[PDB]
Design a protein around this ligand. Structure first.
Ligand SMILES: *[C@@H]1O[C@H](CO)[C@@H](O[C@@H]2O[C@H](CO)[C@@H](O)[C@H](O)[C@H]2NC(C)=O)[C@H](O)[C@H]1NC(C)=O
Ligand SMILES: *[C@@H]1O[C@H](CO)[C@@H](O)[C@H](O)[C@H]1NC(C)=O
Ligand SMILES: *[C@@H]1O[C@H](CO)[C@@H](O)[C@H](O)[C@H]1NC(C)=O
Lengths: 191, 149
């Protein structure tokens, strides 16, 4: 299935506070009103990925990353109440070890660092992602230094979109939360 | 001759910055598929250094350590041996917050910093507010009075 990612996928590009300003920044973002694939499987990791999950009992927990993805790569898993990230060549059907409604994540691999942004917001809907805007604050920066060309989830439907290098115009309010944005290449009015 | 130290001699493409490749896949230097079998035009990508004490200084072993750190954009945990000082408000002072240095007046702020944000910024990209490293309070920075004469 497919659905429309109205305005979601915007994340704080910097860890610096701002307020009541329209700041322009170019980076890998999820283009507005994009066709995001809806899964009710292995996927590429071209230049970053936006993942989204709607859950009632938290069925989806894990992610697998890598090129071949079988004992030759990253693994992430949420065991009960403990996020666990490893880079061992696991056996699925070590040089790193880390241990800690709608949920949205952004995964990026820049200069060997794996950046994971993640937001959370309550919603009452069962069809697709609700129309609205919100920002995905950063949560993890990981020094993996590991090649990435594919990923696969581990589990409750989910949504997958891909990032492109697009300039955006973020609107920081008085309190420092991104309340609106403008894709600089969506349409002539946006330009 | 110490052969415990290795280096990768062949690879289909150059490494991206800070990328780490520990694969041992056989490199096919020719048109014949290797299928994991070493031989002519099928080479093990690694090769050992020849380290003997009589080797020339160019061939002698050197140990290398590269320290990589990203400068001030967020809270910090690695600092130098510099000591600290008490804090005074409502007076023009020279402040040094976690290596970010400047001059101005520090006042109590009403800004709501996020846990991952160290210091704010002004429209002119000059710092506007900071998080005190010892007390979790947000200080607003205002340049102290000036004007023509
Ligand atoms: C990371 O791994 C990918 C494998 O998916 C590498 O992509 C290959 O690059 C070689 C270079 O000549 C090509 O011949 C292959 O066709 C590519 N494979 C695919 C599936 O596209 C990539 O090169 C690796 N990263 C680096 C920096 O080398
Ligand atoms: C900022 O926070 C204050 C409370 O401290 C609240 O009254 C106000 O509505 C907030 N502003 C925005 C834009 O959310
Ligand atoms: C560091 O400073 C804070 C507040 O100034 C204080 O609560 C804490 O106990 C101090 N830590 C040590 C080890 O002195």
């Amino acid at each position: 299935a497919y659905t429309n990612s109205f305005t979601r996928g915007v994340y704080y590009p910097d860890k610096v506070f701002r307020s009541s300003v329209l700041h322009s920044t170019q980076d890998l973002f999820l283009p507005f009103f994009s066709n995001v694939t809806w899964f009710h499987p292995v996927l590429p990791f071209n230049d970053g990925v936006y993942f989204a999950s709607t859950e009632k009992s938290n069925i989806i927990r894990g992610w697998i990353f890598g090129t071949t993805l079988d004992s030759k790569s990253l693994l992430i898993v949420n065991n009960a109440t403990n996020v666990v990230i490893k880079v061992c060549e696991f056996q699925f059907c070590c040089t790193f070890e880390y241990v800690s409604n709608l949920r949205e994540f952004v995964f990026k691999n820049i200069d060997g660092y794996f950046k994971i942004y993640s937001k959370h917001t309550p919603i009452n809907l069962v069809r697709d992602l609700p129309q609205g805007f919100s920002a995905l604050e950063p949560l993890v920066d990981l020094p993996i230094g590991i090649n990435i060309t594919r990923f696969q989830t581990l589990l409750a439907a989910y949504y997958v979109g891909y990032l492109q290098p697009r300039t955006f115009l973020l609107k920081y309010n008085e309190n420092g939360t991104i309340t609106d944005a403008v894709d600089c290449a969506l349409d002539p009015l946006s330009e | 001759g110490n052969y415990n130290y290795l280096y990768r001699l062949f690879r289909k493409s150059n490494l991206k910055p800070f990328e780490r490749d520990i694969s041992t896949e056989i490199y096919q230097a020719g048109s014949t598929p290797c299928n994991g079998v070493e031989g002519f035009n099928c080479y093990f990508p690694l090769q050992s250094y020849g380290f003997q004490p009589t080797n020339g200084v160019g061939y002698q072993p050197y140990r290398v350590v590269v320290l990589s750190f990203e400068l001030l954009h967020a809270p910090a945990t690695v600092c130098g041996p510099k000591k600290s000082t008490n804090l005074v408000k409502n007076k023009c002072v020279n402040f040094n917050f976690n290596g970010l240095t400047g001059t101005g007046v520090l006042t109590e702020s009403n800004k709501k910093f996020l846990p991952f944000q160290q210091f704010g910024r002004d429209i002119a990209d000059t710092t506007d507010a900071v998080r005190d490293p010892q007390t979790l309070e947000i200080l607003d920075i205002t340049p102290c009075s000036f004007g023509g004469v």
